[PDB]
Amino acid sequence: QDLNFGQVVADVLCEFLEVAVHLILYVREVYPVGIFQKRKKYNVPVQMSCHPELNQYIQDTLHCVKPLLEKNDVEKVVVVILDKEHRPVEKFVFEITQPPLLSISSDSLLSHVEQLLAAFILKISVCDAVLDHNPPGCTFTVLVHTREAATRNMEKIQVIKDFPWILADEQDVHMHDPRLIPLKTMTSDILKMQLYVEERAH
Template sequence: MCRHQAVKQYIQNVLTSVTTVLEKAQLEQVVFVILDASHHPLQRFVFELMLPATRVRSSDNLCLLKLEQELRAFILKINTSDAQLTSIPPDNTWVVQVHTSQAAALEMQQHQCVQDFTWIPADDREISMKDRQIIPLKAVSCEVVKVCWKLTDNKQYYSVAEHQYICSSINNEKMQLFVEESGKNE
């Protein structure tokens, strides 16, 4: 749970600003990236979203109930994983990246929901990880949505046993937008 008011507001602004692309099923990933002092990614917590092109009908209540239960378990997994995480050095920072199509990114910029909260293209060094290991953490699937939570770990910096931690101190807040060209995947 976050106690820092500026971080809470930042997360609220992220969620509010991606609403347009989320409602149109154009949001592919939201990525929480932990960066070292040189702004190279150490870890990437990736939330992949696969939404149907059409809205859910009210007759799909059973599916919505299942989705609510799965998402509750998903959030509980995130919340309880905090106990297993180790601290990281204070010189690290973090960013949030949104992966979407270029057209959706432009629309997000044009229909900015939150004033003074502009997304910028991410630096290449903050996106790529040369020697990485992908660790699936949790998946939620039903007719309405599919969500996958995974960790991409930079093996160059950490051993397999050290891949479970998250940034608890914030040195730098930076808004990111990563526009993924069609056909390119992680």
């Protein structure tokens, strides 16, 4: 029928979040380095996992988030690093805002947005210079915070067969007085986004 820039933004963000998740896992050493292969995204160096099951898990997660992003019902996507005790040790928070009305320039939308996203990737690439090394045996999870007015979130997010979502528990989210590491913010004609890390002092 006609173009839908809400969907365009959802596609851009899902593509970018996949690359960002992969690079977070690399720079925080959540998995053995051997699975990663250096590649180029947004014209900057990145590290992509080649482990089939991990890649499908990340893609399944984002396939579920995409329709919520298309409707602008996502407030933030959070990549949480968890210790052996299931307690958050680091949180990479992607705060996502789509303006209620867009004013779109005519000269190369995606190219401009992709240049802005490359800065996020570069920041993630060097965030280990200010974060303390995580304890051994950490895992990760993804948290989706929806807008208060969002309706039927639990049904809308169940896109993938055999990949159910559940409400997180207090233990899944809470950190006591974490350090704040601002990484990057951007404003474009179609989306505003901020990325920062919350690090457990421990």
